């Protein structure tokens, strides 16, 4: 089974990439219930500069063709405290996207809940033996509440709703 | 000279809708986050969420989630905050903070406060 | 949480709060019908504009506020701030 997030207007399939990396926000309010919530990142472009494993395609919310990590998942925060300051997610192997050309981009189901666990196991290594969720982005223009990218001077926006929609306990 | 200013007090129907504003002046608007923080009358404060002015992004505290809309409008300079299924127990004071830092939690400049009460 | 003290007294509220590699802890001071005003960030570092007889410090899990000497302007409620998170209100009334 596969996952198909909607586009518009319809990637051509040659812009197909590699998802390399994510860029997180912690729901805010200590629930004190071994539960943190995690969206993707309600913040501007200053976020995803910060964390400098992405490459040279402007991209939100998700990482296309950037630098990957060594052996092992990598998860990078200027504080891990401040709910305001994304979450930098960096993969140990990528992911690959590939747009059919008729609205739709396409990702393995299988390879994506698997890198959704090791990246739940290593959130745990720095807030505890926790249930880790993910939950859609909380809202914003369409540029960031989508994951938005540009393919040769063309802008691009995909619902991800269905990326952050899991519970790991 | 940074200040904030918001609207005036509202009296609300039990169950309605309440849009709170806070104009911001003196800085560029689209570069600082914006939190809201309730007070009821002799308790403490109480943080709500921040709202990003630059990609409209929003985190809400677990407690509010659900109940509550911040948008911003880069026009005018305004953030609103919308509260809908209004119960007795909110009838506090809404301020909304800027911090010193671009999304830090130190607030340095505050708004004069909005009293909501909510009533029959 | 009441503080009866006089002017000229010292005063130092503890506030108990998770330790910070940073020391992330915010102090503020509050009038009758007022918003909140800041005193102080990062557990010891000042603001602009407030007066030298407030300080602060803070190691491990130990936060405290200090006024050097009570003024007349100094009588308020005070918060601790760490991150989302406010703590209960000390309220600092004249003794007579």
């Known amino acids: 089974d596969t996952i198909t997030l909607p586009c518009r207007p319809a990637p051509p399939p040659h812009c197909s990439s590699n998802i390399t990396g994510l860029i997180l926000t912690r729901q805010g309010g200590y629930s004190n219930a071994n539960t943190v919530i995690f969206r993707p990142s309600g913040g501007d472009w200053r976020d995803i500069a910060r964390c400098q494993i992405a490459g040279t395609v402007v991209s939100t919310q998700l990482f296309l063709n950037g630098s990957l990590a060594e052996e092992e998942v990598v998860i990078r925060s200027e504080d891990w405290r401040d709910n305001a300051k994304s979450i930098c997610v960096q993969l140990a192997t990528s992911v690959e996207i590939a747009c059919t050309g008729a609205g739709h981009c396409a990702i393995s189901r299988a390879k994506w809940a698997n890198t959704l666990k090791q990246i739940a196991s290593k959130l745990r290594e720095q807030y505890g033996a926790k249930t880790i969720i993910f939950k859609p982005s909380s809202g914003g223009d369409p540029e960031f509440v989508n994951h938005s990218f540009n393919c040769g001077g063309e802008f691009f926006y995909c619902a991800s709703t269905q990326l952050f929609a899991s519970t790991w306990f | 000279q940074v200040q904030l200013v918001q609207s005036g007090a509202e009296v609300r129907k039990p169950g309605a809708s309440v849009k709170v504003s806070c104009k911001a002046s003196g800085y560029t608007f689209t570069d600082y986050y914006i939190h809201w923080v309730r007070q009821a009358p002799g308790q403490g404060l109480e943080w709500m969420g921040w709202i990003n002015p630059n990609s409209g992004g929003t985190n809400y505290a677990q407690k509010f989630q659900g109940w509550v809309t911040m948008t911003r409008d880069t026009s005018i300079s305004t953030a609103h905050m919308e509260l809908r299924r209004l119960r007795s127990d909110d009838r506090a004071v809404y301020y909304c903070?800027?911090?010193?830092?671009?999304?830090?939690?130190?607030?340095?400049?505050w708004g004069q406060g909005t009293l909501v009460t909510v009533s029959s | 949480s009441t503080l009866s003290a006089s002017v000229g007294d010292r005063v130092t509220i503890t506030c108990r709060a998770s330790?910070?590699?940073?020391?992330?802890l915010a102090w503020y001071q509050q009038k009758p019908g007022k918003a909140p005003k800041l005193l102080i960030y990062?557990?010891?570092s000042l603001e602009s504009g407030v007066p030298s007889r407030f300080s602060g410090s803070g190691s491990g899990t130990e936060f405290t506020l200090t006024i050097s000497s009570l003024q007349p302007d100094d009588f308020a409620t005070y918060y601790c701030?760490?991150?989302?998170?406010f703590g209960q209100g000390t309220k600092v009334e004249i003794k007579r």
């Open positions: 990062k557990a010891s």
């Open positions: 903070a800027r911090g010193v830092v671009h999304s830090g939690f130190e607030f340095g400049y």
């Open positions: 330790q910070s590699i940073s020391n992330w």
């Open positions: 701030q760490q991150y989302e998170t």
